[PDB]
Design a protein around this ligand. Structure first.
Ligand SMILES: *[C@@H]1O[C@H](CO)[C@@H](O[C@@H]2O[C@H](CO)[C@@H](O[C@@H]3O[C@H](CO[C@H]4O[C@H](CO)[C@@H](O)[C@H](O)[C@@H]4O)[C@@H](O)[C@H](O[C@H]4O[C@H](CO)[C@@H](O)[C@H](O)[C@@H]4O[C@@H]4O[C@H](CO)[C@@H](O)[C@H](O)[C@H]4NC(C)=O)[C@@H]3O)[C@H](O)[C@H]2NC(C)=O)[C@H](O)[C@H]1NC(C)=O
Ligand SMILES: *[C@@H]1O[C@H](CO)[C@@H](O[C@@H]2O[C@H](CO)[C@@H](O[C@@H]3O[C@H](CO[C@H]4O[C@H](CO)[C@@H](O)[C@H](O)[C@@H]4O)[C@@H](O)[C@H](O[C@H]4O[C@H](CO)[C@@H](O)[C@H](O)[C@@H]4O)[C@@H]3O)[C@H](O)[C@H]2NC(C)=O)[C@H](O)[C@H]1NC(C)=O
Ligand SMILES: *[C@@H]1O[C@H](CO)[C@@H](O[C@@H]2O[C@H](CO)[C@@H](O[C@@H]3O[C@H](CO)[C@@H](O)[C@H](O)[C@@H]3O)[C@H](O)[C@H]2NC(C)=O)[C@H](O)[C@H]1NC(C)=O
Ligand SMILES: *[C@@H]1O[C@H](CO)[C@@H](O[C@@H]2O[C@H](CO)[C@@H](O)[C@H](O)[C@H]2NC(C)=O)[C@H](O)[C@H]1NC(C)=O
Lengths: 310, 114, 307, 114
């Protein structure tokens, strides 16, 4: 066989040799070199290391100031929350798993890793859907005198993200160790028809990928003929919405591509490095988002220093 | 509700022959793969053979490389293992597992005593 | 049978019950409540969490700027280095040990925890000896810059390794303290063959009393324009740096003496562990002062951050 | 170079008496404490008794509470265990350990067969 399927897991490595074992039992050092597992932990450490401070500052500064109550700030606080949920919920588990080289926590340990990895991306995705719609309403001016509405659109992101991330935990689809058996994600590997994860992958790529991206570029297409001082501040922040997407596309496409590749070519010959590289790469979502919010948005940066330098 | 039958097998001559069966029920059969795994009286399970969902490429262990042969019927939902030129060490309880793994549904299999 | 001594370890808990085990084998949840071990990890996490960013920024900003080459900045970069050695060398080990509830790494794992804990304090101590002498030379003007500072910064590492290295050499030793999560010098067992009894004298003499004398000896000299205002605030920060160091390290140093005096007495695991973990704030508080009080630095920090 | 002698002990009457000895050599004796620990033929070591360096407060297990008694000589470097009103289960190999622990330095021991 090419890969080795089990009840809980699927190891992308042939069990002709006899070496293959469950990643919920023993370490998976036969997959890749043991130093590469340490390299994961090294990488995954820095995500946790720069995760909390940047997100917690972004969380604190926004709430501390009675100002900063624009739709942009609500969403980018929502991300700062979700990014901390990623760090403490997900990254912790995968950083520990990288040390041991397997999910020593267990199948439930895998769920945590995959859950907040799925939330993080979906809450980032559905937030870019909100940001896409929000600038269409103000710039193109379809609906007049229509700017608490923001908090409703921020609750939208969590409603849709849990529509994606929760069902695996419910038992429709499932989180399963990916690549080096250190991260977790949706089962693209086994058909798992009883679990029905085949149908979920359609549901996910349709409802939680294609529809979002349509709405984004549908809104982006409106401002092709389009592109006072507040509009300059609008422009830079509307430009940041583009850069926020550009980053999101660079981040999540590779993983999403490989996820489709495996779903199409189930049972094919692919190693543990195939999926793990773009998977761990996509966990930069926790850190890059606020760095833009500081970097580009001048209004925030000023207030950040105010909080730091009291 | 899954149900794998384990028909075919019994007492056979040393260096004889035997055709095994595995009637699958209660899942989309053609949509995934099936294997054969045996239980030697002494040591742990040996992965005998395997085959893809389409059935294009079968895979065999070195132990039974060329002697055994695997083939499946998608219409009837069956998996066969034509065993030829048997040996004493081939004596085991044969199970037909799903996916690509040694995880055996049900039990009992078929005691092929050589 | 108040405490339970072993080859590697000493558990501050009677083995009348039969429950006591090595902290290099099994978890020590019989000592304290298992949630308290999680509370350690929680506390110890935040030391690592605020450790790297504050120290790395302080390290980066100082080196990045071609300015900031005053003796103050050399020492407070030296601390920023040692504080990162604490975080990555020591805190990592004790944060992991807090999870499992015992030194799963092993006796060598204990050495790492105790080594950088000893360096951190000694490099902070001997740095305050340097800062004490440095302001005496400028203010009181007994003897009428860059190279001299780097020599006095190398002094701190020379003396700190005189304290921290010998345990690893095998004179004295690092041994799990309190809840068996941190490590430090053996104040508990006589272990005369190791001769840790004599080390404790050596340590409290050479690596505590002599430093503190030199500090207050210099402080005693200063009992009786604008550049001097900048001198004053930075010389005031030297006082605040000591004030913090005294608040930090006295409790641990006191309990360390108490145990050394009253060896084999009745004392629980919380006795030593509280001031021990409290003294690991040395990694974080030092630079916070260097930012807080020193205006000259703060400005340059924002320059680096806000490019 | 440490050297703990394990003198005293042998064959004794059920409900008899016996005085054990432990001549210490090769360390600051009064600077350390000393214990007594026995090896039952079947189960693991039992911590019998202990005493402080000064010798002020001796400590005994519930097993031998009142029957046994411990005392040490700092000048001669010796530790004694006066065992009285013995039992069948007191049959064991007795070791005198250092510190406060059941860690026994290699010793002749003393097989006290009751
Ligand atoms: C990748 O591929 C490898 C290939 O080896 C595979 O490893 C094997 O995994 C299977 C699990 O499916 C293991 O099978 C079990 O082995 C048990 C014994 O294993 C130990 O002991 C043997 C010696 O006996 C050693 O050689 C070995 O190293 C182990 O230390 C065995 O007891 C199991 O079989 C019993 O239990 C099952 C389940 O209940 C039962 O169905 C069987 O009938 C059997 O019970 C028997 O019952 C009778 C009646 O009561 C009783 O009298 C008799 O004593 C019992 N039989 C025995 C043998 O005692 C089971 O076969 C197998 O050991 C692994 N191989 C190795 C090298 O150990 C990996 O799992 C694959 N990786 C993945 C995750 O895909
Ligand atoms: C705190 O106090 C407890 C009190 O029990 C100590 O626990 C005992 O530690 C001693 C240390 O030597 C153990 O002694 C050894 O036991 C072995 C067998 O133990 C297992 O098997 C028995 C049944 O046979 C079970 O009842 C038991 O639970 C264990 O699973 C023996 O094989 C050993 O004998 C060998 O070594 C000795 C060394 O002196 C030789 O003299 C012998 O000839 C032989 O080679 C040995 O006797 C004892 O088993 C422990 N008891 C327990 C709880 O199981 C703790 O160690 C102590 N803690 C600290 C930190 O000091
Ligand atoms: C492990 O995965 C590899 C792919 O990564 C599988 O190889 C594939 O095997 C099938 C069946 O032999 C090939 O399909 C056939 O290809 C020929 C030539 O292109 C074509 O004429 C036939 O009509 C048919 O499509 C497939 O090409 C091949 N893939 C490649 C490019 O190597 C392999 O079977 C897997 N192993 C097992 C047994 O799981
Ligand atoms: C455990 O330590 C306690 C002290 O913390 C010891 O108690 C002392 O015992 C001496 C006699 O040996 C008395 O003179 C003291 O007054 C006691 N101190 C107090 C105030 O409790 C105790 O003996 C120790 N246990 C052993 C057996 O070593």
């Amino acid at each position: 066989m090419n890969g080795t399927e089990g009840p809980n897991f699927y190891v992308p490595f042939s069990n002709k040799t006899g070496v293959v074992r469950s990643p919920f039992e023993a370490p998976q050092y036969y997959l890749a070199e043991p130093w590469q597992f340490s390299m994961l932990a090294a990488y995954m450490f820095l995500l946790i290391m720069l995760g909390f401070p940047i997100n917690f500052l972004t969380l604190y500064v926004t709430v501390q100031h009675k100002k900063l109550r624009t739709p942009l700030n609500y969403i980018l606080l929502n991300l700062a929350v979700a990014d901390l949920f990623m760090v403490f919920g997900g990254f912790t588990t995968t950083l520990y798993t990288s040390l041991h080289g397997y999910f020593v926590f267990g199948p439930t340990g895998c769920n945590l890793e995959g859950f907040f990895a799925t939330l993080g991306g979906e809450i980032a995705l559905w937030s870019l859907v909100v940001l896409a719609i929000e600038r269409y309403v103000v710039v193109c001016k379809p609906m007049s005198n229509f700017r608490n509405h923001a908090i409703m659109g921020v609750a939208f992101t969590w409603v849709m993200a849990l529509a994606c991330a929760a069902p695996p935990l419910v038992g429709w689809s499932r989180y399963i160790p990916e690549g080096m058996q250190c991260s977790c994600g949706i089962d693209y590997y086994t058909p798992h028809e009883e679990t029905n994860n085949e149908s979920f992958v359609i549901y996910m790529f349709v409802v939680h990928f294609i529809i979002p991206l349509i709405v984004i570029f549908f809104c982006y297409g409106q401002l092709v003929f389009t592109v006072a001082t507040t509009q300059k501040a609008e422009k830079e922040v509307t430009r940041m919405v583009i850069i926020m997407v550009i980053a999101f596309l660079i981040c999540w496409l590779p993983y999403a591509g490989v996820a489709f590749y495996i779903f199409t070519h189930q049972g094919s010959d692919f190693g543990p490095i195939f999926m793990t590289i773009p998977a761990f790469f996509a966990k930069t979502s926790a850190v890059y988002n606020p760095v833009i919010y500081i970097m580009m948005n001048k209004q925030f940066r000023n207030c950040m220093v105010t909080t730091l330098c009291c | 509700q899954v149900q794998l039958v384990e028909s075919g097998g019994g007492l056979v001559q040393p260096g004889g022959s035997l055709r095994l069966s595995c009637a699958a029920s209660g899942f989309t059969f053609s949509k995934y793969a099936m294997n054969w795994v045996r239980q030697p009286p002494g040591k742990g399970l040996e992965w005998v053979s395997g085959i893809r969902p389409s059935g294009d490429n079968p895979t065999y262990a070195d132990s039974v490389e060329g002697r055994f042969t695997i083939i499946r019927d998608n219409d009837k939902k069956m998996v066969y293992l034509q065993m030829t030129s048997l040996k004493t060490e081939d004596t085991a309880v044969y199970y037909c597992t799903r996916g690509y793994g040694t995880m055996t549904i049900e039990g009992q299999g078929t005691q092929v005593t050589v």
